[PDB]
Amino acid sequence: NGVGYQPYRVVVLSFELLHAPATVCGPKKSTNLVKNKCVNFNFNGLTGT
Amino acid sequence: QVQLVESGGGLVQAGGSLRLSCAASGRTFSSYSMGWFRQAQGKEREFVATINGNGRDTYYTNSVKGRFTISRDDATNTVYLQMNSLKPEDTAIYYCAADKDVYYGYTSFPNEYEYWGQGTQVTVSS
**Cα–Cα distance measured from residue B111 to residue B91, given in angstroms and rounded to the nearest whole number:** 21
CA distance A39 to chain B (A): 34
Pairing outcome for strands B92-96 and B78-81: unpaired
Provide the CATH number for the domain around residue B27: 2.60.40.10
Resolution (A): 3.7
Q: CB-based contact (8 Å) between B104 and chain A?
A: no
Which experimental method was this entry solved with? cryo-EM
Residue B117 neighbours by CB distance under 10 Å: 23
Domains of chain B: total: 1
Comparing CA positions, the residue from B80, B71, B64 lying closest to residue B23 is: B80
Q: Which residues of B41-55 are buried (b: 16+ CB within 10 A; e: fewer)?
A: eeeebbbbbbbbbee
Backbone angles phi, psi at A5, to 5 degrees: -125, 25
Please give the residue range of the domain that contains residue B23: 3-122
Pairing outcome for strands B34-39 and A47-48: unpaired
Q: CB-based contact (8 Å) between A21 and chain B?
A: no
Residues 6+ apart with CB under 8 A from B3: B23, B24, B25, B26
Chain B residue nearest residue A5, CA to CA:
B111
**Cα–Cα distance measured from residue B37 to residue A25, given in angstroms and rounded to the nearest whole number:** 38
Q: Do B31 and B48 form a contact (C-beta atoms < 8 A)?
A: no
